[PDB]
């Protein structure tokens, strides 16, 4: 399964979570930004690696980073 990391440059704009096609990211409470929220990656087993999450990231060099790793039938997007 791929690896997804969140960095404290998160501004809690939720654009990553609402762009994930496989429900990998979610918004959790935080105290490091104005919005009081930070993205989390608790379901990386469903991560497919499409990187839509970091295409919607407005922070300078990203706050969500996807590191491709071992492959799985879920991560390979295999309907068969």
């Amino acid at each position: 399964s791929h690896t997804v990391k969140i960095y404290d440059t998160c501004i809690g704009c939720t654009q990553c979570v609402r762009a994930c096609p496989t429900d990998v990211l979610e918004m959790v409470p935080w105290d490091g930004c104005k919005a009081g929220q930070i993205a989390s990656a608790p379901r990386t087993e469903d991560c497919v690696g499409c990187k839509r999450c970091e295409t919607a990231c407005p922070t300078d060099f990203l706050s969500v980073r996807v590191y491709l790793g071992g492959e799985t039938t879920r991560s390979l997007g295999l309907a068969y």
Binding site: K5, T9, T22, M27, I38, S40, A41, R65
Partner: protein, 130 residues
């Protein structure tokens, strides 16, 4: 006509699940609709909702979530996605805590959070042979 009365009025497509969603895992999405709206299947073509309970089975979590995202355009929000293992091993997936992941809910802990920016990552040469 169909196995269950709650199935959407779909005529069947050769784009549904395969032998994989009989021995590895299958995904089911359930929702209740006020109207028998006509919607597009994530796999094939057009299906008709039931004015009530609707249940659909798919081979991938992404297919169920694409269907759910389409449902939001019909003002449908109560859709819920489950994972079924080879036997009846049902696990609720998408509304994991009953609140959509885009809305902050208490009781969630940060997973995969690093307390630094990208520039603070360690040099790969110091991560050799571990």
């Amino acid at each position: 006509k169909l196995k269950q009365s709650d199935f959407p009025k779909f005529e069947g497509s050769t784009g549904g699940w395969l032998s994989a969603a009989k021995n590895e895992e299958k995904y089911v999405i359930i929702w209740t609709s006020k109207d028998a709206s006509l919607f597009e299947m994530p796999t094939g073509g057009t299906a008709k909702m039931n004015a009530g309970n609707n249940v659909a089975y798919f081979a991938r979590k992404e297919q169920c979530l694409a269907l759910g995202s389409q449902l939001r355009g019909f003002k449908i929000t109560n859709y819920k996605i489950f994972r079924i293992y080879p036997p009846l091993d049902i696990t609720l997936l998408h509304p994991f805590d009953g609140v959509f992941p885009e809305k902050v809910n208490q009781g969630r802990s940060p997973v995969g959070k690093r307390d630094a920016s990208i520039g603070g990552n360690p040099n790969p040469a110091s991560l050799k042979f571990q």
